[PDB]
């Protein structure tokens, strides 16, 4: 009964761990792509709009997208990009580990 | 007593409660009906099982 679920969970975790590419050998672009920058800005703006904690000084600002742009400028966005290779294997680059433009 | 449910007609049932919610169009549901009229079924596999 439950052991069927335990087997399925074990298999899912094993396939996930096999798909992940370890940090020491990721061969993708060091630069943040324009698509990644846009989606980081949009998602961080959504999170701020939904009352998430903010890591920058609000200069009396009200635009969530502007606040997210400020966070990206000061590299304070707690997000991670999971770049997907065609075979389903993926790498993980943190936002502060990437260079904009 | 948990997995028993009723219709308006009163026909009692004991069965599938493994149902979730997704976010789909509505023309998808209409296409599903138009395919069922053709005798074709569509199985949609959800991510978390």
């Amino acid at each position: 009964g439950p052991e069927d679920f335990q087997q399925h969970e074990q298999i899912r975790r094993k396939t996930l761990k096999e798909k992940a590419i370890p940090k020491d050998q990721r061969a993708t672009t060091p630069y943040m792509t324009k698509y990644e920058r846009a989606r980081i800005l949009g998602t961080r703006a959504l999170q701020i709009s939904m009352n998430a904690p903010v890591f920058v000084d609000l200069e009396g600002e009200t635009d969530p997208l502007r606040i997210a742009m400020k966070e990206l400028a000061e590299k304070k966005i707690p997000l991670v990009i999971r770049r997907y290779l065609p075979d389903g294997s993926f790498e993980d680059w943190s936002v502060e580990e990437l260079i904009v433009d | 007593d948990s997995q028993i449910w009723e219709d308006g007609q009163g026909n009692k049932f004991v069965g599938g409660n493994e149902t979730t919610t997704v976010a789909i169009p509505f023309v998808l549901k209409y296409l599903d009906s138009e395919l069922s009229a053709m005798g074709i079924r569509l199985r949609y596999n959800v991510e978390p099982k």
Binding site: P22, L46, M50 | -
Partner: protein
């Protein structure tokens, strides 16, 4: 009075992005207390040992900073979690 370790898939609000443990507790675990749950078997007395399954499998379980998967069209994060539930059923 039986311990039932369970695994659940629970959302996480952006407001609890600093203490996801408290977020999961107050979002899904507290409203699971003193209710007959159709899965575990009976009423739930409490819970203990909540663990969040990291979305990156490489990071060792020692670390306290983990990854949560954010919905593409929503700032809510979904994640698998492990917790042991204290239950009561005849």
């Amino acid at each position: 009075i039986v311990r039932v370790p369970i695994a659940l898939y629970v959302s996480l609000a952006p407001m609890y992005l600093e203490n996801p443990l408290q977020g999961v507790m107050k979002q899904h675990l507290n409203p699971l207390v003193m209710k007959y749950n159709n899965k575990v078997g009976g009423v739930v007395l409490g819970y203990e040992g909540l663990k969040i399954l990291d979305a990156d499998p490489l990071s060792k379980e020692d670390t306290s900073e983990k990854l949560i998967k954010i919905t593409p069209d929503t700032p809510f994060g979904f994640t698998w979690c492990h917790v042991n539930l204290y239950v009561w059923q005849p």
